[PDB]
Design a protein around this motif. Structure first.
Motif, PDB file in Angstrom:
ATOM      1  N   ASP A  55      77.034  46.416 -12.679  1.00 64.35           N
ATOM      2  CA  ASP A  55      78.406  46.868 -12.506  1.00 64.35           C
ATOM      3  C   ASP A  55      79.072  47.443 -13.899  1.00 64.35           C
ATOM      4  O   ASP A  55      80.192  47.920 -13.898  1.00 64.35           O
ATOM      5  CB  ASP A  55      79.591  45.998 -12.148  1.00 64.35           C
ATOM      6  CG  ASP A  55      79.653  44.554 -12.884  1.00 64.35           C
ATOM      7  OD1 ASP A  55      79.425  44.783 -14.047  1.00 64.35           O
ATOM      8  OD2 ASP A  55      80.106  43.557 -12.579  1.00 64.35           O
ATOM      9  N   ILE A  60      76.470  40.293 -18.339  1.00 60.82           N
ATOM     10  CA  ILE A  60      75.403  39.910 -17.191  1.00 60.82           C
ATOM     11  C   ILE A  60      76.034  38.779 -16.538  1.00 60.82           C
ATOM     12  O   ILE A  60      76.086  37.856 -16.909  1.00 60.82           O
ATOM     13  CB  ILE A  60      73.957  39.797 -17.643  1.00 60.82           C
ATOM     14  CG1 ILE A  60      73.403  40.842 -18.274  1.00 60.82           C
ATOM     15  CG2 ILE A  60      73.190  39.492 -16.393  1.00 60.82           C
ATOM     16  CD1 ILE A  60      72.156  40.626 -18.895  1.00 60.82           C
ATOM     17  N   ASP A  61      76.191  38.793 -15.307  1.00 57.23           N
ATOM     18  CA  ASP A  61      76.810  37.723 -14.535  1.00 57.23           C
ATOM     19  C   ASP A  61      75.635  36.927 -13.626  1.00 57.23           C
ATOM     20  O   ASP A  61      74.493  37.704 -13.826  1.00 57.23           O
ATOM     21  CB  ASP A  61      77.949  37.917 -13.439  1.00 57.23           C
ATOM     22  CG  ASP A  61      77.495  39.079 -12.499  1.00 57.23           C
ATOM     23  OD1 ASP A  61      76.195  39.140 -12.045  1.00 57.23           O
ATOM     24  OD2 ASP A  61      78.373  40.138 -12.219  1.00 57.23           O
ATOM     25  N   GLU A  64      73.799  39.446 -11.005  1.00 60.35           N
ATOM     26  CA  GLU A  64      72.985  40.456 -11.956  1.00 60.35           C
ATOM     27  C   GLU A  64      71.817  39.949 -12.508  1.00 60.35           C
ATOM     28  O   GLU A  64      70.711  40.636 -12.395  1.00 60.35           O
ATOM     29  CB  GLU A  64      73.884  41.106 -13.184  1.00 60.35           C
ATOM     30  CG  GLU A  64      75.032  42.149 -12.432  1.00 60.35           C
ATOM     31  CD  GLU A  64      75.892  42.509 -13.510  1.00 60.35           C
ATOM     32  OE1 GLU A  64      76.021  41.559 -14.843  1.00 60.35           O
ATOM     33  OE2 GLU A  64      76.624  43.391 -13.305  1.00 60.35           O
TER      34      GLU A  64
HETATM   35 CA    CA Z   1      77.865  42.775 -15.370  1.00 61.90          CA
END
Ligand code: CA
Ligand code: CA
Ligand code: CA
Ligand code: CA
Lengths: 139, 25
Positions: A55, A60-61, A64
């Motif tokens: 996104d 970074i989640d 992801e």
């Molecule tokens: Ca992200």
């Protein structure tokens, strides 16, 4: 993905998420890399985040991260870990192979430490650590 | 007991393998 694979990845994510806030930043990535003795540049950190940051919010989640780990899958992490120790692939970790991994990971070693590590893991007494003994040691 | 050393190698190896994944995109 199976929940077991998602749980392994969650644990992998948690090795990088230093504040536990559920995102991996460039600084958290670089921290871990430095701890491994790498010297990443800002450019390399940003390039590695950029490919995974779906996104584009800059971090970074876990979804992801999970999408990156899933693409990799297309062995279990404890299996891949054993293969890193068992460099000649005979299914047994020898003292020399353990020395090699300790050296590659910056773990200072001595022969006696290496022998005791093997001895403690070595259920069947053959002088080496097979996969089943490896996983039991890791529990 | 040397279980701690074994666990530290595994932790580092897991970190190194995730770093490799980032590197490989
Ligand atoms: Ca992200
Ligand atoms: Ca974080
Ligand atoms: Ca071997
Ligand atoms: Ca054995």
């Amino acid at each position: 993905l199976t929940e077991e694979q998602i749980a392994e990845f969650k644990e992998a994510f948690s090795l990088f998420d230093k504040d536990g806030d559920g995102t991996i930043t460039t600084k958290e990535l670089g921290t871990v890399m430095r701890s491994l003795g790498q010297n990443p540049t800002e450019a390399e950190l940003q390039d590695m985040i950029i490919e995974v940051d779906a996104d584009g919010n800059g971090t970074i989640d876990f979804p992801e991260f999970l999408t990156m780990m899933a693409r990799k899958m297309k062995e279990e992490e404890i299996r891949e870990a054993f293969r890193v120790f068992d460099k000649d692939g005979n299914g047994y970790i020898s003292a020399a192979e353990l020395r090699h991994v300790m050296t590659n990971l910056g773990e200072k070693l001595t022969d006696e430490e290496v022998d005791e590590m093997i001895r403690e893991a070595d259920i069947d007494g053959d002088g080496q650590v097979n996969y089943e003994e490896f996983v039991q040691m890791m529990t | 007991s040397k279980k701690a050393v074994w666990h530290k190698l595994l932790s580092k190896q897991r970190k190194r393998a995730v770093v490799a994944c980032f590197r490989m995109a």
